[PDB]
Amino acid sequence: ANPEYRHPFMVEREVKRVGYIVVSSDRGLCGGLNINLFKSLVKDMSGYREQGAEIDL
Amino acid sequence: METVVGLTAIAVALLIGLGALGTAIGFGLLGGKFLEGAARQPEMVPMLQVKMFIVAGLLDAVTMIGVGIALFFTFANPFVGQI
């Protein structure tokens, strides 16, 4: 309804720095919950490390 | 006869002057809304500009009937014949 304004969150800047919010448990006794999550995090983070981009966590 | 000629000069000034006053205030109102609309969305400017000229034909209608009659009182004169 208001095309005159576009908040910085609704427009993409194609530059080399990214951020991640990582959710994990406090307690143990989990059947691979954190392990499979960190494996997926490392898999996607490496794409940015290899593309020369910096990462914040 | 000098009253008819002198009062025709005032009639001409009132007839052109009240049209110069109305057209400048009336289009400054419309024009401001056109610039505001252009700022809200520059994609619709060609369409909005055409809509502004469509209203400009209604706004300047009667002001030209007075500019035509006033220029018809300065060169020709329908009141001198009437004595």
Q: Short summary of the structure?
A:
This is part of a larger assembly, with chains A (57 residues) and B (83 residues). Chain A is α+β, with helices and mostly antiparallel strands and 57 residues long.
Description:
The structure is cut from a larger assembly and holds chains A (57 residues) and B (83 residues). Chain A is α+β, with helices and mostly antiparallel strands and 57 residues long. Chain A has one helix at residues 33-50, and strands at residues 17-19, 54-56. Chain A has one helix and two strands; from the N terminus they run βαβ. Chain A has a two-stranded parallel sheet. Chain A starts with 16 loop residues before the first strand and ends with a strand. Chain B has helices at residues 2-40, 45-59, 61-74, 78-81. The longest helix of chain B has 39 residues, at 2-40. The radius of gyration of chain B is 19 Å and the shape is elongated. Chains A and B meet through loops of A and loops of B. It is classed as electron transport. The entry lists the keywords ATPase, electron transport, energy. The entry is titled "Pseudomonas aeruginosa ATPase State1 F1Fo focused". Chain A is ATP synthase gamma chain.
Please bin the fraction of helical residues of chain A.
25-40%
Largest interface: A-B, 2 and 4 residues
Proportion of beta-strand residues of chain B: under 5%
Q: Summarize the amount of helix of chain B as a percent range.
A: over 70%
First-last Cα distance of chain A: 35 Å
Q: From the structure provided, what is the oligomeric state, counting identical versus distinct chains?
A: part of a larger assembly
Kindly name the structural category of chain A.
alpha+beta
Per DSSP, the total helix count of chain A is 1
Q: What's the β-strand tally of chain A? A: 2
Spell out the helices and strands of chain B N to C: HHHH
Largest sheet of chain B: none
Number of helices of chain B: 4
Strand order of the largest sheet of chain A: 1-2
Which class best fits the helix and strand makeup of chain B? mainly alpha
For the CA atoms, what is the radius of gyration of chain B? 19 Å
**Termini separation of chain B:** 7 Å
Share in β-strands of chain A: 5-15%
- Please trace the helix and strand order of chain A, writing H or E for each element: EHE
Principal-axis shape of chain B = elongated
Work out the radius of gyration of chain A. Answer: 17 Å
